Amino acid sequence: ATAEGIPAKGTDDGTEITLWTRSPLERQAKNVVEAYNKSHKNQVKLEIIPNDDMEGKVGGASQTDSLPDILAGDVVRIPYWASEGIFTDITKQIDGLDNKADLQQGHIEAGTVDGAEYTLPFITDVSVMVWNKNLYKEAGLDPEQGPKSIDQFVEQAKKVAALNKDGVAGSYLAGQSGGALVFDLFPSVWADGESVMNKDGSEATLDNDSMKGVLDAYKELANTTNGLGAGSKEETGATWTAPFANGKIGVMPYPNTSTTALFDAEKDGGFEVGVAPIPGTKEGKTSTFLGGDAMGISKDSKHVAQAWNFLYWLMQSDAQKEVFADQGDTASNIQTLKTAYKDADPRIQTINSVIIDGNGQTPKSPAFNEAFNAAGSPWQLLVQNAVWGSGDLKADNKAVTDVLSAQ
Ligand SMILES: OC[C@@H]1O[C@H](O[C@@H]2[C@@H](O)[C@H](CO)O[C@H]2O)[C@H](O)[C@H]1O
C-alpha cells in the first residue's frame, strides 16, 4: 500500500472500507462509522475486537497480509506497530490537513517514526475521577467535592468503605490489567510534575515519590475493610468499569468513553455521578492519560485513497461535532472542544478542560505492551507487590526498564 498520488480529500467512490477497533471504544466507534456511512458512497465495514485480542489479531493478519483498510489501535500500542511497518506512510496526507495543529497531537506522535507519520486520532479516551454522589451523601461527604489529592482520595474512599454495607467499597483497582493501571495511576505522577519513563523512553522512572504515594494509597485501601471492591485483585480488565457503573464503588479513576453510559443511567433515575480531574499527591495538581485509539491505513490496503477519505472526513470540526460533541463524547479536535460544548453537561465541560489545559500525556515506547499492558508484565507485578504483597520498588522498576530497553 502507498498514499502516492491520492487526492488531498481522498476518494469517495462506493468502495467498501474495512475498519478494526476495540470493544472499550465500541459506543464512539459505532457513532463515527454510522455518521460516515450515512453521508458517503464509500461504506465502512466495522469490526469491534476485544481489547486483549488486538495484538494477536494484528500480528496474525500482518503475516497473511489480511490487515483491514483502517486499523485503529490503542495509542500505547501504535509505536510498536508503526515501527514494524503495519501502516502505510501518510506523512504527506497528514501534513496537508489545513487543521493539523488542532488535532490531538499525542495520537499523531504515537505513529511518528523519525518524522514519518502513520496515524491520526480516531477516538480520544482520557482518564478522570468519578464518584457516586449517593454513596458520598450516605457516608457524610459533600457530594459536590471530588478528591483534590491522593490523600483526599483515600479519605473519601475510606468514608464510603465505613458505610460497612454488603457490596459497597471505597474504590476499585484493576489488579491484573496493566493497561487500566497505567491509565488510572500514571496521571497522579504527571500531576506532580514527575515522569514514568526517562528522557529517551528506554527506562522506567516509577521509583519516585509520586508513584510511591499512589501505591501507598491503594495499599491503605487494600488494608481497609471494604476499601477496594471484591474482584480488584483478580480484575483482568474485562470488567473493571462494571462495579462503579453498578453503584458499588465510591470513587475511582475511569474512562471518559464509559461516562455517557453513567450519565444515561442517572437520567433514567440511577445514582448521580461526580466527575473531576485525577489529582496528584500534591493538592490542586491534576493530569490525565491522553489515551484511546489512533488509526492509520494498513500496509495491506488496496483502497488507500478511499481509506484516506474517512481519515480526512473525521478530522473536520463539523464531523467531530456530529459524532462526538452531539453524542456527549469528547472530540479529538481542540477547536471542537472549545466551541461545540458551550451548553453541554458541566461534567463533559470538566472532561474537556483536562485536554484543553494541556497537562495530560501519552506515553510512547515500542515496548509499551510488553512492559505494561501485557498479562503478568513487570508493571503489573510492581503494582501487585506494592498493593497486596511486599515489593522492592527499585528492583521492580528496573524489571520494567529491562523490558523497555531490550534490543
Ligand atoms: O491501554 C492504555 C490506555 O488505557 C485505556 O484503555 C484501557 C485498556 O488498557 C483497559 C483494558 O481494557 O480498558 C481500557 O479502559 C485507554 O483507552 C488506553 O489508551
Tab-separated table of C-alpha atoms and ligand atoms in Angstrom:
chain	number	residue	atom	x	y	z
A	1	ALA	CA	0.000	0.000	0.000
A	2	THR	CA	1.192	3.596	-0.780
A	3	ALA	CA	-0.544	7.025	-0.454
A	4	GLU	CA	1.467	8.328	-3.520
A	5	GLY	CA	-0.767	10.441	-5.807
A	6	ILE	CA	-4.026	10.229	-3.751
A	7	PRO	CA	-6.325	13.299	-3.637
A	8	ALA	CA	-5.926	15.768	-0.709
A	9	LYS	CA	-9.528	14.874	0.459
A	10	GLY	CA	-9.245	11.212	-0.618
A	11	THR	CA	-11.673	9.398	-2.948
A	12	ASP	CA	-15.400	8.770	-2.234
A	13	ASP	CA	-16.405	6.178	-4.906
A	14	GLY	CA	-18.501	3.421	-3.214
A	15	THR	CA	-15.514	1.297	-2.007
A	16	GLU	CA	-16.155	-0.985	0.993
A	17	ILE	CA	-13.526	0.068	3.600
A	18	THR	CA	-12.741	-2.338	6.498
A	19	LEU	CA	-12.011	-0.789	9.938
A	20	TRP	CA	-10.901	-2.568	13.148
A	21	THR	CA	-11.108	-1.081	16.658
A	22	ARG	CA	-11.633	-2.374	20.185
A	23	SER	CA	-14.557	-3.164	22.499
A	24	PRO	CA	-13.899	-0.432	25.169
A	25	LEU	CA	-14.463	2.253	22.429
A	26	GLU	CA	-17.493	0.484	20.828
A	27	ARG	CA	-20.075	3.213	21.597
A	28	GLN	CA	-17.986	6.002	19.987
A	29	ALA	CA	-16.796	3.819	17.054
A	30	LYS	CA	-20.398	2.871	16.075
A	31	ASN	CA	-21.404	6.583	16.178
A	32	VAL	CA	-18.426	7.603	13.946
A	33	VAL	CA	-18.933	4.832	11.347
A	34	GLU	CA	-22.761	5.306	11.154
A	35	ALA	CA	-22.264	9.077	10.501
A	36	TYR	CA	-19.693	8.384	7.735
A	37	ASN	CA	-21.814	5.644	6.113
A	38	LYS	CA	-24.947	7.872	6.070
A	39	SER	CA	-23.036	10.668	4.224
A	40	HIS	CA	-20.613	8.866	1.780
A	41	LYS	CA	-20.693	6.482	-1.178
A	42	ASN	CA	-17.821	4.565	0.442
A	43	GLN	CA	-19.069	2.292	3.254
A	44	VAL	CA	-17.075	1.264	6.362
A	45	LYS	CA	-17.472	-2.375	7.481
A	46	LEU	CA	-16.693	-2.145	11.236
A	47	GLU	CA	-15.180	-4.980	13.312
A	48	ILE	CA	-15.115	-4.471	17.106
A	49	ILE	CA	-12.410	-6.691	18.665
A	50	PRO	CA	-11.886	-7.399	22.383
A	51	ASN	CA	-9.135	-5.206	23.891
A	52	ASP	CA	-6.848	-8.138	24.792
A	53	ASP	CA	-7.192	-9.769	21.300
A	54	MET	CA	-5.967	-6.873	19.181
A	55	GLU	CA	-2.235	-7.706	19.369
A	56	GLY	CA	-2.730	-11.373	18.282
A	57	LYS	CA	-5.255	-10.309	15.588
A	58	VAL	CA	-2.894	-7.594	14.150
A	59	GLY	CA	0.236	-9.854	14.319
A	60	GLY	CA	-1.573	-12.749	12.551
A	61	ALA	CA	-3.207	-10.520	9.918
A	62	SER	CA	0.169	-8.803	9.208
A	63	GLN	CA	1.700	-12.298	8.474
A	64	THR	CA	-1.102	-13.267	5.987
A	65	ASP	CA	-1.377	-9.665	4.593
A	66	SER	CA	-5.047	-9.533	5.706
A	67	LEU	CA	-4.910	-6.281	7.770
A	68	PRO	CA	-8.027	-4.128	7.321
A	69	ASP	CA	-8.007	-0.905	5.269
A	70	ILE	CA	-8.089	1.188	8.507
A	71	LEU	CA	-6.515	-0.216	11.685
A	72	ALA	CA	-7.309	1.697	14.870
A	73	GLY	CA	-5.035	0.813	17.822
A	74	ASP	CA	-4.558	1.881	21.434
A	75	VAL	CA	-2.122	4.872	21.242
A	76	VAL	CA	0.272	2.927	23.577
A	77	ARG	CA	0.380	0.009	21.053
A	78	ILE	CA	0.818	2.180	17.925
A	79	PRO	CA	4.588	2.914	18.248
A	80	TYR	CA	5.413	-0.863	18.090
A	81	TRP	CA	3.036	-1.405	15.089
A	82	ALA	CA	4.338	1.744	13.250
A	83	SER	CA	7.965	0.584	13.938
A	84	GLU	CA	7.225	-2.873	12.381
A	85	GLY	CA	5.659	-1.496	9.112
A	86	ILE	CA	1.961	-2.240	9.906
A	87	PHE	CA	0.909	1.165	8.438
A	88	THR	CA	1.183	2.985	5.092
A	89	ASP	CA	3.289	6.196	5.266
A	90	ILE	CA	0.739	9.081	5.177
A	91	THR	CA	3.117	11.946	6.135
A	92	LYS	CA	2.136	13.984	3.006
A	93	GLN	CA	-1.592	13.454	3.636
A	94	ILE	CA	-1.444	14.293	7.394
A	95	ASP	CA	0.824	17.329	6.776
A	96	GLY	CA	-1.632	18.532	4.114
A	97	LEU	CA	-4.538	18.843	6.639
A	98	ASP	CA	-5.175	22.616	6.999
A	99	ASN	CA	-6.223	21.939	10.665
A	100	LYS	CA	-3.432	19.503	11.711
A	101	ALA	CA	-2.404	21.837	14.611
A	102	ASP	CA	-5.983	21.384	16.066
A	103	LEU	CA	-5.793	17.555	16.293
A	104	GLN	CA	-4.892	15.554	19.449
A	105	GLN	CA	-1.089	15.639	18.982
A	106	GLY	CA	-0.403	12.578	21.224
A	107	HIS	CA	-2.236	10.407	18.648
A	108	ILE	CA	-0.072	11.765	15.783
A	109	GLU	CA	3.133	11.433	17.904
A	110	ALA	CA	2.168	7.766	18.694
A	111	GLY	CA	2.518	6.867	14.963
A	112	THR	CA	5.531	9.164	14.236
A	113	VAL	CA	8.806	7.312	13.370
A	114	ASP	CA	11.742	9.772	12.791
A	115	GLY	CA	9.198	12.313	11.489
A	116	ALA	CA	7.362	9.837	9.176
A	117	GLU	CA	3.655	9.927	10.216
A	118	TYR	CA	1.385	6.839	10.144
A	119	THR	CA	-1.579	7.784	12.413
A	120	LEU	CA	-4.314	10.295	13.242
A	121	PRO	CA	-6.566	10.338	16.326
A	122	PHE	CA	-9.676	8.081	15.982
A	123	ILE	CA	-11.263	8.166	19.490
A	124	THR	CA	-9.840	10.086	22.456
A	125	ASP	CA	-10.097	8.153	25.770
A	126	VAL	CA	-8.973	10.111	28.838
A	127	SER	CA	-8.919	9.039	32.499
A	128	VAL	CA	-10.933	11.075	35.037
A	129	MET	CA	-12.071	10.669	38.597
A	130	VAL	CA	-15.680	9.596	39.018
A	131	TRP	CA	-17.619	9.248	42.282
A	132	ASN	CA	-21.053	8.089	43.384
A	133	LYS	CA	-22.751	11.157	44.908
A	134	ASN	CA	-25.440	8.941	46.575
A	135	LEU	CA	-22.696	6.951	48.433
A	136	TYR	CA	-20.905	10.253	49.285
A	137	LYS	CA	-24.174	11.668	50.805
A	138	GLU	CA	-24.874	8.425	52.763
A	139	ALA	CA	-21.220	8.472	54.030
A	140	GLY	CA	-21.469	12.149	55.146
A	141	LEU	CA	-19.192	13.518	52.380
A	142	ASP	CA	-20.063	16.671	50.453
A	143	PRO	CA	-21.344	15.040	47.204
A	144	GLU	CA	-20.078	18.022	45.110
A	145	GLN	CA	-16.383	17.669	46.153
A	146	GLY	CA	-14.170	15.093	44.429
A	147	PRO	CA	-10.629	14.421	45.666
A	148	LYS	CA	-8.021	17.249	45.221
A	149	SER	CA	-5.091	14.949	46.193
A	150	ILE	CA	-4.315	11.246	46.517
A	151	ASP	CA	-4.621	11.645	50.348
A	152	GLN	CA	-8.135	13.125	49.958
A	153	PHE	CA	-8.972	10.247	47.530
A	154	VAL	CA	-8.016	7.724	50.335
A	155	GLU	CA	-10.003	9.783	52.923
A	156	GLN	CA	-13.149	9.865	50.703
A	157	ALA	CA	-12.796	6.142	49.712
A	158	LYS	CA	-12.392	5.250	53.437
A	159	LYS	CA	-15.520	7.268	54.453
A	160	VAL	CA	-17.589	5.290	51.842
A	161	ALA	CA	-15.956	1.983	52.911
A	162	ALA	CA	-17.049	2.786	56.537
A	163	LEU	CA	-20.722	2.554	55.406
A	164	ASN	CA	-19.973	-1.142	56.154
A	165	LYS	CA	-22.631	-2.362	53.637
A	166	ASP	CA	-22.657	-5.613	51.558
A	167	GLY	CA	-21.255	-4.900	48.070
A	168	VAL	CA	-20.198	-1.260	48.812
A	169	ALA	CA	-16.453	-0.433	48.678
A	170	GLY	CA	-14.492	2.851	48.772
A	171	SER	CA	-12.611	2.354	45.481
A	172	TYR	CA	-11.582	-0.329	42.950
A	173	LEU	CA	-8.161	-1.231	41.403
A	174	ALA	CA	-7.813	-3.184	38.113
A	175	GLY	CA	-5.228	-5.502	39.747
A	176	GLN	CA	-4.331	-7.695	36.725
A	177	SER	CA	-4.898	-5.071	33.934
A	178	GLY	CA	-1.593	-3.342	33.195
A	179	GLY	CA	-3.386	-1.074	30.680
A	180	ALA	CA	-6.150	0.067	33.061
A	181	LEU	CA	-3.389	0.539	35.758
A	182	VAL	CA	-1.221	2.910	33.570
A	183	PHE	CA	-4.449	4.767	32.513
A	184	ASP	CA	-5.657	5.165	36.141
A	185	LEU	CA	-2.332	5.642	38.045
A	186	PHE	CA	0.074	7.496	35.615
A	187	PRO	CA	-1.897	10.799	35.770
A	188	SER	CA	-1.225	11.177	39.571
A	189	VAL	CA	2.540	11.030	38.796
A	190	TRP	CA	2.324	13.517	35.874
A	191	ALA	CA	0.076	15.819	38.005
A	192	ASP	CA	3.026	16.211	40.445
A	193	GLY	CA	5.447	17.043	37.559
A	194	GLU	CA	7.125	13.567	37.836
A	195	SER	CA	7.788	11.149	34.947
A	196	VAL	CA	7.185	7.398	34.452
A	197	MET	CA	9.811	6.994	31.717
A	198	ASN	CA	13.216	8.571	31.176
A	199	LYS	CA	14.273	11.292	28.637
A	200	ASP	CA	14.611	8.726	25.752
A	201	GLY	CA	11.726	6.202	26.601
A	202	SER	CA	14.098	3.252	27.241
A	203	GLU	CA	13.935	3.280	31.095
A	204	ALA	CA	11.088	3.302	33.615
A	205	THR	CA	11.266	6.009	36.353
A	206	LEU	CA	8.496	4.551	38.584
A	207	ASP	CA	10.738	4.591	41.713
A	208	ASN	CA	9.686	8.221	42.533
A	209	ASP	CA	7.837	9.903	45.439
A	210	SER	CA	4.536	10.396	43.493
A	211	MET	CA	4.269	6.763	42.383
A	212	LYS	CA	5.123	5.642	45.916
A	213	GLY	CA	2.290	7.869	47.247
A	214	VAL	CA	-0.204	6.413	44.736
A	215	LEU	CA	0.812	2.792	45.603
A	216	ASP	CA	0.736	3.703	49.357
A	217	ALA	CA	-2.883	4.941	48.824
A	218	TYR	CA	-4.093	1.711	47.184
A	219	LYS	CA	-2.288	-0.434	49.824
A	220	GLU	CA	-4.094	1.532	52.594
A	221	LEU	CA	-7.428	0.827	50.833
A	222	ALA	CA	-6.414	-2.875	50.361
A	223	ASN	CA	-5.887	-2.997	54.184
A	224	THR	CA	-9.280	-1.287	54.899
A	225	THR	CA	-12.457	-3.367	55.344
A	226	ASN	CA	-14.447	-2.662	52.106
A	227	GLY	CA	-11.554	-0.340	50.937
A	228	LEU	CA	-11.331	-1.915	47.478
A	229	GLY	CA	-14.245	-3.707	45.790
A	230	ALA	CA	-14.235	-7.537	45.692
A	231	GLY	CA	-12.522	-8.636	42.441
A	232	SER	CA	-9.901	-5.807	42.465
A	233	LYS	CA	-7.005	-8.244	42.909
A	234	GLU	CA	-8.211	-10.640	40.107
A	235	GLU	CA	-9.545	-7.916	37.700
A	236	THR	CA	-8.217	-8.867	34.201
A	237	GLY	CA	-9.532	-5.668	32.519
A	238	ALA	CA	-12.679	-7.371	31.160
A	239	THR	CA	-14.948	-5.984	33.985
A	240	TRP	CA	-13.027	-3.052	35.531
A	241	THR	CA	-15.664	-0.330	34.643
A	242	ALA	CA	-18.582	-2.558	35.836
A	243	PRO	CA	-18.525	-2.176	39.687
A	244	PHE	CA	-18.707	1.645	39.544
A	245	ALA	CA	-21.476	1.592	36.850
A	246	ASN	CA	-23.392	-0.864	39.139
A	247	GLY	CA	-23.295	1.713	42.031
A	248	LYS	CA	-20.995	-0.432	44.248
A	249	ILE	CA	-17.916	1.875	44.327
A	250	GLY	CA	-17.446	5.275	45.974
A	251	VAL	CA	-14.683	6.876	43.854
A	252	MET	CA	-12.115	5.755	41.269
A	253	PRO	CA	-10.349	6.691	38.025
A	254	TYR	CA	-12.452	5.821	34.977
A	255	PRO	CA	-12.548	6.217	31.158
A	256	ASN	CA	-14.383	9.277	29.744
A	257	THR	CA	-15.616	6.912	26.968
A	258	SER	CA	-17.545	4.974	29.701
A	259	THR	CA	-19.130	8.170	31.272
A	260	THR	CA	-22.006	8.664	28.709
A	261	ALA	CA	-23.415	5.257	29.905
A	262	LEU	CA	-23.279	6.577	33.538
A	263	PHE	CA	-24.940	9.927	32.606
A	264	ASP	CA	-27.698	7.909	30.781
A	265	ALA	CA	-28.237	5.655	33.875
A	266	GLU	CA	-28.559	8.858	36.052
A	267	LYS	CA	-31.089	10.372	33.607
A	268	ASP	CA	-33.061	7.098	33.972
A	269	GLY	CA	-33.223	7.737	37.820
A	270	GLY	CA	-29.992	5.913	38.806
A	271	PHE	CA	-27.287	7.246	41.161
A	272	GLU	CA	-25.799	10.713	40.492
A	273	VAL	CA	-22.213	10.847	39.121
A	274	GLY	CA	-19.477	13.311	40.038
A	275	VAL	CA	-16.579	13.874	37.563
A	276	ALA	CA	-13.290	15.719	38.252
A	277	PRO	CA	-9.678	15.527	37.041
A	278	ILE	CA	-7.374	12.899	38.587
A	279	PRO	CA	-5.206	14.591	41.239
A	280	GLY	CA	-1.507	14.355	42.174
A	281	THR	CA	-0.146	13.577	45.628
A	282	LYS	CA	0.231	17.420	45.618
A	283	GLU	CA	-3.104	19.111	46.357
A	284	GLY	CA	-4.627	21.035	43.445
A	285	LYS	CA	-2.337	19.319	40.850
A	286	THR	CA	-4.177	17.394	38.080
A	287	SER	CA	-3.477	15.455	34.898
A	288	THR	CA	-4.916	12.770	32.637
A	289	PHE	CA	-3.852	9.915	30.435
A	290	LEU	CA	-4.375	11.095	26.835
A	291	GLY	CA	-5.318	7.652	25.507
A	292	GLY	CA	-7.826	5.972	23.203
A	293	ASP	CA	-7.204	4.761	19.649
A	294	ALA	CA	-5.251	6.302	16.809
A	295	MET	CA	-5.786	4.998	13.280
A	296	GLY	CA	-3.824	4.531	10.097
A	297	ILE	CA	-4.121	2.880	6.682
A	298	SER	CA	-2.664	-0.660	6.866
A	299	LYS	CA	0.223	-1.835	4.631
A	300	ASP	CA	-2.293	-4.303	3.059
A	301	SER	CA	-4.964	-1.743	1.981
A	302	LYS	CA	-5.779	-1.877	-1.766
A	303	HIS	CA	-8.008	1.217	-1.137
A	304	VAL	CA	-5.635	3.873	0.228
A	305	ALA	CA	-7.373	6.916	-1.396
A	306	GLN	CA	-10.774	5.672	-0.116
A	307	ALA	CA	-9.460	4.922	3.428
A	308	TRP	CA	-7.875	8.445	3.403
A	309	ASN	CA	-11.369	9.884	2.605
A	310	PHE	CA	-12.528	8.529	6.021
A	311	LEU	CA	-9.420	9.866	7.874
A	312	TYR	CA	-9.794	13.299	6.209
A	313	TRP	CA	-13.565	13.467	6.899
A	314	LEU	CA	-13.228	12.665	10.641
A	315	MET	CA	-10.588	15.384	11.258
A	316	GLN	CA	-13.016	18.166	10.235
A	317	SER	CA	-14.551	20.101	13.183
A	318	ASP	CA	-18.119	19.632	11.796
A	319	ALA	CA	-17.618	15.776	11.682
A	320	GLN	CA	-16.102	15.852	15.191
A	321	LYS	CA	-19.112	17.892	16.438
A	322	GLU	CA	-21.599	15.426	14.832
A	323	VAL	CA	-20.004	12.158	16.019
A	324	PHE	CA	-18.508	13.203	19.432
A	325	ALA	CA	-19.933	16.513	20.836
A	326	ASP	CA	-23.562	15.939	19.666
A	327	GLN	CA	-23.385	12.438	21.308
A	328	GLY	CA	-21.954	13.705	24.679
A	329	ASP	CA	-18.445	12.392	23.832
A	330	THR	CA	-15.002	14.080	23.905
A	331	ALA	CA	-13.664	15.147	20.435
A	332	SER	CA	-10.051	14.732	19.156
A	333	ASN	CA	-10.073	18.310	17.697
A	334	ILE	CA	-9.366	21.175	20.209
A	335	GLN	CA	-11.426	23.633	18.034
A	336	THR	CA	-14.443	21.295	18.553
A	337	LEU	CA	-13.632	21.049	22.323
A	338	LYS	CA	-13.519	24.920	22.641
A	339	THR	CA	-16.669	25.594	20.502
A	340	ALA	CA	-19.110	22.621	20.393
A	341	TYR	CA	-19.874	22.101	24.151
A	342	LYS	CA	-20.985	25.584	25.353
A	343	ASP	CA	-24.344	24.275	26.688
A	344	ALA	CA	-23.061	20.700	27.372
A	345	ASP	CA	-23.358	18.955	30.777
A	346	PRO	CA	-20.762	20.695	33.001
A	347	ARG	CA	-19.135	17.258	33.720
A	348	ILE	CA	-18.409	16.965	29.948
A	349	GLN	CA	-17.005	20.535	30.101
A	350	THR	CA	-14.868	19.310	33.070
A	351	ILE	CA	-13.600	16.281	30.992
A	352	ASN	CA	-12.748	18.588	28.004
A	353	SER	CA	-10.950	21.092	30.320
A	354	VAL	CA	-8.310	18.438	31.220
A	355	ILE	CA	-7.471	18.132	27.465
A	356	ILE	CA	-7.704	21.874	26.670
A	357	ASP	CA	-5.488	22.734	29.706
A	358	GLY	CA	-2.750	20.540	28.166
A	359	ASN	CA	-1.436	18.817	31.327
A	360	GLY	CA	-2.065	15.175	30.254
A	361	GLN	CA	0.471	12.879	28.494
A	362	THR	CA	0.526	9.963	26.017
A	363	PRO	CA	3.400	7.586	26.835
A	364	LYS	CA	5.426	6.401	23.790
A	365	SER	CA	7.552	3.240	23.613
A	366	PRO	CA	7.801	0.428	21.043
A	367	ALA	CA	7.960	-1.994	24.026
A	368	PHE	CA	4.971	-0.486	25.930
A	369	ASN	CA	2.725	-3.585	25.681
A	370	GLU	CA	5.424	-5.992	26.896
A	371	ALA	CA	6.495	-3.674	29.789
A	372	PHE	CA	3.000	-2.513	30.907
A	373	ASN	CA	-0.278	-3.765	29.295
A	374	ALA	CA	0.701	-7.485	28.897
A	375	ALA	CA	-0.702	-10.055	31.346
A	376	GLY	CA	1.920	-10.550	34.105
A	377	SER	CA	4.040	-7.600	32.844
A	378	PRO	CA	6.776	-6.307	35.192
A	379	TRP	CA	4.498	-3.250	35.763
A	380	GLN	CA	1.570	-5.462	36.868
A	381	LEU	CA	3.925	-7.359	39.244
A	382	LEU	CA	5.272	-3.996	40.593
A	383	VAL	CA	1.706	-2.866	41.459
A	384	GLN	CA	0.621	-6.285	42.834
A	385	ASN	CA	3.716	-6.399	45.185
A	386	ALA	CA	3.173	-2.794	46.402
A	387	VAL	CA	-0.598	-3.046	46.988
A	388	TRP	CA	-1.222	-6.698	48.076
A	389	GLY	CA	2.223	-8.168	48.870
A	390	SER	CA	5.671	-6.761	49.583
A	391	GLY	CA	7.873	-5.278	46.896
A	392	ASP	CA	11.265	-3.728	46.213
A	393	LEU	CA	10.211	-0.735	44.064
A	394	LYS	CA	13.842	-0.121	42.887
A	395	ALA	CA	14.107	-3.806	41.725
A	396	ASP	CA	10.534	-3.926	40.278
A	397	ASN	CA	11.136	-0.667	38.385
A	398	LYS	CA	14.427	-1.996	36.910
A	399	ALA	CA	12.437	-5.095	35.722
A	400	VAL	CA	10.202	-2.679	33.680
A	401	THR	CA	13.368	-0.908	32.338
A	402	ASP	CA	14.869	-4.290	31.322
A	403	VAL	CA	11.828	-4.866	29.033
A	404	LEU	CA	11.728	-1.237	27.695
A	405	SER	CA	15.496	-1.335	26.861
A	406	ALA	CA	15.536	-4.925	25.390
A	407	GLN	CA	17.277	-4.973	21.950
B	1	LIG	O1	-4.226	0.877	27.424
B	1	LIG	C1	-3.855	2.178	27.887
B	1	LIG	C2	-4.977	3.193	27.888
B	1	LIG	O2	-5.998	2.806	28.834
B	1	LIG	C3	-7.304	2.833	28.250
B	1	LIG	O3	-7.587	1.585	27.738
B	1	LIG	C4	-7.980	0.670	28.704
B	1	LIG	C5	-7.410	-0.667	28.402
B	1	LIG	O4	-5.984	-0.717	28.501
B	1	LIG	C6	-8.225	-1.263	29.531
B	1	LIG	C7	-8.204	-2.685	29.418
B	1	LIG	O5	-9.371	-2.733	28.626
B	1	LIG	O6	-9.666	-0.809	29.418
B	1	LIG	C8	-9.495	0.442	28.747
B	1	LIG	O7	-10.181	1.374	29.525
B	1	LIG	C9	-7.124	3.722	27.033
B	1	LIG	O8	-8.179	3.639	26.036
B	1	LIG	C10	-5.713	3.348	26.568
B	1	LIG	O9	-5.143	4.282	25.659
